[model samples]
Target: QAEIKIGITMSASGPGAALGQPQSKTVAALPKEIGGEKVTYFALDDESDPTKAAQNARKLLSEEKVDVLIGSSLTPVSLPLIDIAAEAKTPLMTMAAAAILVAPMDERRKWVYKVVPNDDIMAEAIGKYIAKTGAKKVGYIGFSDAYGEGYYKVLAAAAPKLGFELTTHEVYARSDASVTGQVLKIIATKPDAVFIASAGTPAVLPQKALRERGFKGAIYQTHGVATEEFIKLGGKDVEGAIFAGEAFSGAEDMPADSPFRKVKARFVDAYKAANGGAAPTIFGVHLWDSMTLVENAIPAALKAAKPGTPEFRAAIRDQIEKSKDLALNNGLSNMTPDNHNGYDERSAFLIEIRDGAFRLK
Candidate 1:
């Protein structure tokens, strides 16, 4: 028997629930066994707290003794898991979009890898897209935390090269009830486009506030807002909004020959069939990608060593890092020890929200 123990955590409540709820839901659709043996999986909610994410990681590593670990939905939550994963020598695969989550691939981050594409990649694409639209002056409003800063850092560097001037930088906490002041300040600058980086449904506040205050400039959202919860929350306000997202979120728009075509249809069809026709989002697709990656590596890991041994854990990690050109629903991954995310510009695509559905733009 070759059973691999996998433990998972996500912020199923609080600020990130918009991303976490669908993430948690994907667990039900996962396989019961990775190789030929029964697999045991445990899931916990961190309530969108980085502290709680650390606590959960400790529990998964120390108590559950999981050979593989995944999760902590937001960038902040994923940040703490890095230390715990390094200490335990357990492979941690994060689902957040912060480049810091996996880049610079240092010693402490050796045990950490990521399923989500880096923020820098998306930032470059977004910056150029806005600039190509002739938006030379842009205002930015995003979370006060790492997710926003990580992305802004990339955008700032790429802005000038893309021929745009990032005029204003404003931030608000994820739980903020209003960004009225931030919106007003950006409006005063009269930017041709405003980039809003808040994740989940809370991202809507700035968009709605901008609309209420009569700022007619273009609004650009990040990949984090690819969930149905965000679209429904934004309602009529988010119409005409521009954002970048994983190809899986807009799977219906991909052509027949695309490698992602079948995988996306399979996951979306399964999710809708099981969940009352609810469309699966990229957040959930991140989890699906991670699990699929693990499943692909499990047989190889078993060949290296039987489950329940440190050797097996090392094998699983190597198999994950060595995954080459594996076609996933989101993108083709070619992970390496130094390069974990392993996706290029093709990882994300431009999207427009029309009638609450993601339409490829």
Candidate 2:
């Protein structure tokens, strides 16, 4: 069998570990070969630090010489590897949710692609939901980085168009211990709800802070927190939190005809079996879908060129860029050179945290 080497990095043990842990689990379960080629996959963690993510990407490219690269779990962590992948002419399939990561493609970002729906997509779903709540005024608190800033931008634009007024916007650092200062400012506005653009379990801190301060409005989250661990960490603090995300987590209720239903069942079941009956977050299924895309593209790529050469890497990139009607857990994705995040509304839906688990709302 032809050897097809791959490398990946996730924030497996750091602040982003909730999402990263599942990604690592899914990587362990990936099939050993694609199109009959022996797959050699290497995984690493960057502690959810962008600086370290770049270094890891460098090692994968310069030393490991991996043919395909995948993931950095979180958007901020994935941002640092864009230029590195470009410099190496390596196709990096990011697990990050920022549309900016692959949008308006440049020479540097041309090599970057993503498996998840962009935050802008989720922002629209969330903004519309907030508007439906009859929330005339809204407040926002997001991380200071690209992931936070990206969702804030989309919601800022989507809010007014959907008949909601955004009263204020506050920012915080991921490493910061408290968002009290920013939450206080958002509270001062007395808006109907506050959207926490912070991803991962760290998002709980801001909401809990708001709750402690007696802010009575609704709490909105981004798709970044679409993991079981978020509920586990947030506890009673995050009850009734609302957002839109990948359909896999709530797939058991989906109609049988929906493509996501079967794929979601297969993934959730297998993931539970492997992880001791633990439910999968979007991160786990996303990693699986990322590999699925590679699996679908491998045969075509192999037809174009042999493995273990620059030509093969280029061929894989081309096949991925030209992907058509790929049935992914998120949706039926169709990738192109210009639109790397090719998912539409089918890949996402609104959900609510009810009784410590996600319930379609």
Candidate 3:
């Protein structure tokens, strides 16, 4: 029997650690056996740094010789690993939520796949929700990185179509301790609402600042702010803030017949059991869904070529592309050569933070 080795790079420290730590924990809880073959995972922390992410990918591909790659939490980290995956001719199933990571279907991106819903999909959801609120202008505050730029581009393009004008575009680095200036500028624009396009605990800064400064029309966040840490850190200020995020985060709100329920429950039960009753976050399922994709493809990949070879890696990539109606913990995915992100609107849920709890809206 051939052993299956998986390599992972995540921001298990630094700004994105809230999401990144969960991904590493999810990998630890994944099954050790798939298709009757022993599976092993080697995970590394990129500390939310692009250089570190590239270094980890290089080490995994060349030295560890991992059959497939799953990686870094944020767009900056995930984006740099794409070309490396293409050169290695191995599949990179990323945990990051940027549309550009897999879109345009460029030669480099062809080797990349994403378990997280694209920024556009979630952006459209937020756009539609904002339109319903009768908000004419929406201020934008986001990270000064690829993640923020991706969401801003989508929201900006959809603004006219969604019946709103994008107001100020204020940016900040994830490491920034203060977004006071950005918040004040956004408040001065006096938009009907503010939309923050950042992830993890770092996302809380702008929301807290906006609230502290008394700019209270409405606050919107992307899936990036779905972590529990964001709510905890923002506390009272985050109350009633609306956002669009993965369905897995609010699985109980899903219909009983929803495909995500069973898979989510399976993982949730395993995760809670493994972690002394701590609940799993949507970020954890980003990695879990990629694992699900890999498990689905492995049996076929084994038949096409033996493990530990370039042919086997290509075979795995092909098998993943052939995925059909895969009920991932986060979404119903139908993978195709042109569509590597593999999720639809069904993957996103409109949620509000009510009394420190994420209430489905």
Candidate 4:
């Protein structure tokens, strides 16, 4: 009658709570078992604070004694928990995309893994997209946070290699309500495209501000804006805005029998059922994938371990690392340690908001 317990920390209140809440829902909805052993989930809210995130992680691992920890709606909240999890030897899986999350990994801390694509791949996709479009001059607008900084560095480094010039770069607070001033400043430079790298509501503000100011050019967004919230918030302004990220839906490139199709459909249907049939965004899709990873690992661990031992945790971690070419319900390839990011540039898809829905261009 032994059961596996997993802990998750995400923002339930504060700026990023909207994103975190869905993630919590997805984790809660994860199937209890692959082969009939019981599973349980305990989640905490970080209130969108890094200190709060670390505090919650400690509480989850120390008090609740969860076998594994998965979370982090934002990178800033996720990065600090890496060190904490490593010290305790608790397996930590994150959905955050900060390059720093993977940077700390080496031969040590084998328990750490991430489900989201790193900033490097995201930047490379955007950089290559811009080059192909012949957008020589670009303006950069990002939040002044870890997530923003990650995109800033990756984009800056990739721009030169891809033969594009950054005309102007600006930063705004993650909580900033309006970025008109910063958007105007960048518009003054008259760049051919504007690259925005902010998550949550902040991602939608710049596009609105730019349109109001009559600066019409290609407005490029990073994976941060791939969620439906950005489209709902920006409405028509979000139209024609291009973004690059792992494909969660509308990927014609995938085979019809792809596993992701069913996973994605079930998640959307369940989310809508919970929220009155409202379709979920790609952020929710990421959470679904994160929870799926945990579910898939359990059976592998059980098969590798003695029926009732703490050694199951390490066994599961090892098996998860070795898994490759396996497809999750979401249609993404199950990752190994070397490819834990679980996606490559080819897996990245470009989409634009069209008629209030994300349409591939």
Top candidate, metric TM-score: 3
lDDT of candidates 1 onward, in order: 0.85, 0.83, 0.88, 0.75
Ranking by lDDT: 3, 1, 2, 4
lDDT of 3 at 325: 86
Worst 10 residues of 4 by lDDT: 326-335
Candidate achieving the largest lDDT: 3
Q: Per-residue lDDT tens digits of candidate 2, residues 1-361?
A: 3488889999898788887888898876687878978998889988898898888899988988888889898888888788888778778899888888898778777787788888888888888888888998889888888888898898887876799888888888876898888888888888888888987888889989999999888999987787877898888889999888877756656787877787887777788877888767788877888888888878988887777677888888888888888777776788987888778776678888999888787
User: Each model's TM-score, in the order given?
Assistant: 0.96, 0.95, 0.97, 0.91
Better of 1 and 2 by TM-score: 1
CA RMSD for every model? 1.5, 1.7, 1.3, 2.4
Q: What is candidate 2's CA lDDT for residue 155?
A: 87
Clashing pairs in 3: none
Per-residue lDDT tens digits of candidate 4, residues 193-261?
889888876788888888899878899887777767777788988888887776674554456676666
TM-score of 4: 0.91
Predicted candidate 3 versus true structure: per-residue lDDT over 310-338, tens digit per residue: 98899989888888888886677888899
lDDT of 1 by residue, 1-361 (tens): 5367888899899999988888888777777876787888888999999999899999988988898889889998889899888889888878887888888888867787787788888888887789899989999999999999976888898888899988788999999888899999999998898999879989999999999999888899998888778888899889878887777766678788877888887777777776788877778877888888888888998888888788888888888888888778667788988888888887878988888888888
lDDT (Cα) of model 1: 0.85
Clashing pairs in 4: 260-330, 260-331, 272-277
Candidate 4 deviant stretches above 4 angstroms = 107-109, 252-256, 270-276, 304-310, 328-331
